[PDB]
Design a protein around this nucleic acid. Sequence first.
RNA 1: AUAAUAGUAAAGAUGAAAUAAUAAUAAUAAUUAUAAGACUAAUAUAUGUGAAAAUAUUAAUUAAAUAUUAACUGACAUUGAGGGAUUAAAACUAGAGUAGCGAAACGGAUUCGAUACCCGUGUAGUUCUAGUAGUAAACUAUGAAUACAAUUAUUUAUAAUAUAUAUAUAAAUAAUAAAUGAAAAUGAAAGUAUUCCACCUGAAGAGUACGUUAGCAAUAAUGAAACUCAAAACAAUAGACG
Lengths: 86, 34, 125, 45, 203, 154, 58, 233
Amino acid sequence: EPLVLSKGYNIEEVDKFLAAIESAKRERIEKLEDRREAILRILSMRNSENKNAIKMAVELARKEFERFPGDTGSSEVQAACMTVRI
Amino acid sequence: DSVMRKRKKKMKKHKLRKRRKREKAERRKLSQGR
Amino acid sequence: MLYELIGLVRITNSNAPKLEAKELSSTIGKLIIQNRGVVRDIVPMGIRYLPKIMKKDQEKHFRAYHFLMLFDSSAAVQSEILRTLKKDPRVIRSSIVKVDLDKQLDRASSLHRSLGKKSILELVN
Amino acid sequence: QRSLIDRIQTRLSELLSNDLKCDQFLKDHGNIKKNLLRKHVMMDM
Amino acid sequence: TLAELLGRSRIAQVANNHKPLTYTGKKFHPTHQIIETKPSTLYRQEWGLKSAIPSKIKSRYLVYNDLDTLERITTFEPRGGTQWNRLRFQEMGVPIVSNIGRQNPFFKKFNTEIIGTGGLSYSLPGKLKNSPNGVIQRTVVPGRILNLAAIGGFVADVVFFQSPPSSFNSMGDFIRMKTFLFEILEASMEKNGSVSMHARLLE
Amino acid sequence: SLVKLANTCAHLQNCSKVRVALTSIPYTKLQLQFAYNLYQQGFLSSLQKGSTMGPDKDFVEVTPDNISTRRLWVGLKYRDNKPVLSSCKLISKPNSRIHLPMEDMKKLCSGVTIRNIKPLQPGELILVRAHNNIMDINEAISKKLDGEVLCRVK
Amino acid sequence: KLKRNYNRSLLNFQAHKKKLNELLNLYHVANEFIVTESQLLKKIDKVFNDETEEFTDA
Amino acid sequence: MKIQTNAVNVLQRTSAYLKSGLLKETPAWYNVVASIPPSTKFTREPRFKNPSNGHIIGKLVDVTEQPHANNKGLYKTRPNSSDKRVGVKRLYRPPKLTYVEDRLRSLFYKQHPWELSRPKILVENEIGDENYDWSHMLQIGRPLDGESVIQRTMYLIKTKQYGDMVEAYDHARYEFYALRMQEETEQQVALEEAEMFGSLFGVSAIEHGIQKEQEVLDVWEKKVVEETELMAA
RNA sequence: AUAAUAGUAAAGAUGAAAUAAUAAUAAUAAUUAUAAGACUAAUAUAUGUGAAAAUAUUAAUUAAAUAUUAACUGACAUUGAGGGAUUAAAACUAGAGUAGCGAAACGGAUUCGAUACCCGUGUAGUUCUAGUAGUAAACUAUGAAUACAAUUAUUUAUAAUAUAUAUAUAAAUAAUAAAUGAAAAUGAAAGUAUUCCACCUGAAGAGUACGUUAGCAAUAAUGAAACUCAAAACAAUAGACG
Ligand SMILES: [Mg+2]
Ligand SMILES: [Mg+2]
Ligand SMILES: [Mg+2]
Ligand SMILES: [Mg+2]
Ligand SMILES: [Mg+2]
Ligand SMILES: [Mg+2]
Ligand SMILES: [Mg+2]
Ligand SMILES: [Mg+2]
Ligand SMILES: [Mg+2]
Ligand SMILES: [Mg+2]
Ligand SMILES: [Mg+2]
Ligand SMILES: [Mg+2]
Ligand SMILES: [Mg+2]
Ligand SMILES: [Mg+2]
Ligand SMILES: [Mg+2]
Ligand SMILES: [Mg+2]
Ligand SMILES: [Mg+2]
């Protein structure tokens, strides 16, 4: 998917963070947009390694299968984690 | 196996190889069509 | 993926040596940016003499202009950039090498790290 | 969460320290004794 | 307890170090605790260490690192030259003062740097020294010129009115043989713990 | 378990060989019982519960918070330059577990080789499990318990 | 259980904080970074035309 | 080396001989050895306290004994890897004896290098006989040195005049310095007095040193000339 | 290897010599300039890494990998007949490639002889791509797993210490104690124990024959008996010998 990020980031959260930073700076446009674009490019999946994508897939699988929030090691979740790698 | 003992085995293996070399045409004749 | 580059460009013209280098830097930087990439730094290095008389196809070179380009890209993009470098007649030696971002995000060029400055923030300050 | 964790522990430690106080606290509420105290503390917080 | 006694006792008192006994670099102050015997105790090879020390050693003083090693020998060197340097310095009687405008450290978390002097001189600068002949203004000390001058267990910077050719140029690099007199002006002490003396050649 | 028991026996033997005084063992029920039996017969000088790091001075209750780090400390015994607990061969091995009736145990006690067991010796102790309770073989005979012939100490 | 939940969540939070800090640092840096053509050209001019700070050792 | 049975079982072996009639007469030692038996119990005995510090060797801190949060704010809810490993070798290997005074000693000689040059006799006189009140530094049987300072610091710490260790150390150092200065002045003035009243010292320390240097130089010179000649040829 | 330059009679080889695509058609050596394959100097210790075969010029991609913490699962483990996959060098089947090396072959020496050791031409082969095959002193001649036992010295990593100290852990490597052992010696295993698999039961005949399966083939696995001996083998000892 098109605006998915690596390194355990989320695009919606990143934009919000950037906005908050901007607000803080103001308290204390084109260029800013360009910087934001550069950041997105850096943190995009499609520029990053396959390893990050796999990790993300594993995390997703865990989220799906976990019989409660903490579960890692549920036989089913372990199997799911194995599957992505396989 | 010491080396001395091995040498008898080696010799035997060589003899066997020689026999096989000798009986190549004979073996071929025996093999085909029966 | 942060890839460092080291290209040793040709210097045919005696009086104005850096022009070919500058053109190379422009072109490869343009390619990078067209292909989802982000060039971070373009560190120049001097008009340094080569160790031996290094030769390209039907040419010979004894002095060259050296530079680092420290850019982000995909792997396929990087590979293609490398291929384009290998192809062109105005570079003697090219070398892309990965800079690992598993620990940090801001990473300076190899030279800057050797000097002392780990991140580009330090260089800025 | 951290504050909650702290409160239960600190109260329990205080209860352990004072025996006379502990019995009175238990009466007010309503190894086994220690467990009951702990349960009461949990209910409170 | 035994442990307390051990902690008190004279081997525990010697502060441990694994610095080289042979150090060919620059020596600005003592490295190791000098350890003497009495003559009687030397006679029956006892130094108050783990083991007996070889009968080949006839000097009463020594320096050591390890009470016992894997090689089954105490790591020592039979020499206590540093005490003699200190005693020479005392005899010379030139009081060490900080050339920088600072209070004397002996008057009034941890600082490992050298507190004033290292304890080669606890002398104070204000005294004069009378004799039968009179009050000594200029301290006369014999030393050797190297090329700097070796003056009583210390190397010292030297100055003069005119460079004497007769003594110097007759034996250019055998100046160490002939002992010359010196007038020691003052002794300063730097951060590294080196005593920077300054002498004047007399003739 | 029986493998565990064999391991502890081997450990005891090792400790006897080099002359250590005080030795740790795993904290299980069977193991504890065995240790108690040895103590009562007179092979161990001491028996006490404790941590993985050492024997415990005061009482510490064992829970899921502790259990993994818990341990059974055991004092060994020597006299006239000879260890008391020389051997700890077990009889019922994990692969060939043997369970005798009372008659067979009696025969063993009275110098009869049974099921390829050398019959029990002058200063020996054959331990016997009977309804998850380790006993002396003589004790088991007296009570009349058909049981698993566990192990053998000398 | 509560303690274990806290331990799980605290570490995750710390990691998140670290990631945010890293992002902030990147943003601070990124005026020097290049995406557009004009910026790249300016960088080139700075590097080459000035004839200053060529990385050569002596 | 195996534990030898035959060094300690001597009387038993002789008792057997006596019983047999191999020995007609009993040895002189036989009755004595019977009266006073050997140990014959060559065990590795475990130790539970470090004697110097007074740290406990055997015990393990539990999860329940550590209720509050750790550095980096994580509550210990499980035994760690090291809490599961059977730490028996610690009970048996002899303890490394540590003292607070050792660090102070190390500090002192770093601060005062030339205190090392003051020679130290290590051959003990009766350790039981001494009786030093560390109210003051100058004890009688003991000389003035860094040790005395350190003892004074320890005394101060004990008495809680200076609650902090560093302050007590400084105080002890300052006490020492005055004494040292006094000692220095004593010797110089004694020398002056001697000079005044017509005392005659044949060899002064500096003169002695010069003489010592001279012999070495003479040795060097002859050797050096030979070496130069060798080099030439 | 080819070509050019200038230059002069030997060059190359060996124990010493010759034969040869050596050289008065102008070489060899030298300096240049093209091409071609195949190899990877130091670092290097195969340290380490890999299941084992293996694996050290550089880079990139994808895969797998260590430790400690936190949380979770709750005995899910061990071993493993049959089975499966990978498996040096040589060999083979295709299609490229072929510098150097080099079975065979031919020639020169050596020698009484020389189907050799040395030298010269040098084909298969060695190289790549796609396969076949599944053996080696495939060796640590030592199957895997777990619990345990006395020291020292080296490194390596981890934690604390008030970044550079002396400490606690592990891990490996080297000396040993005990123990074991026919001894040599093994040394956290060849020790103390437990579990599981493989395999051995005198020497010859024989890993041969017959049979079967598999392979393009060479072959690989499986694997007898008759006949004949009181032999046959290992560690160590003291000689003699080189
Ligand atoms: Mg064999
Ligand atoms: Mg293996
Ligand atoms: Mg190499
Ligand atoms: Mg190979
Ligand atoms: Mg092949
Ligand atoms: Mg072919
Ligand atoms: Mg040939
Ligand atoms: Mg295959
Ligand atoms: Mg074969
Ligand atoms: Mg085989
Ligand atoms: Mg091999
Ligand atoms: Mg032995
Ligand atoms: Mg055995
Ligand atoms: Mg054997
Ligand atoms: Mg060995
Ligand atoms: Mg058949
Ligand atoms: Mg076969």
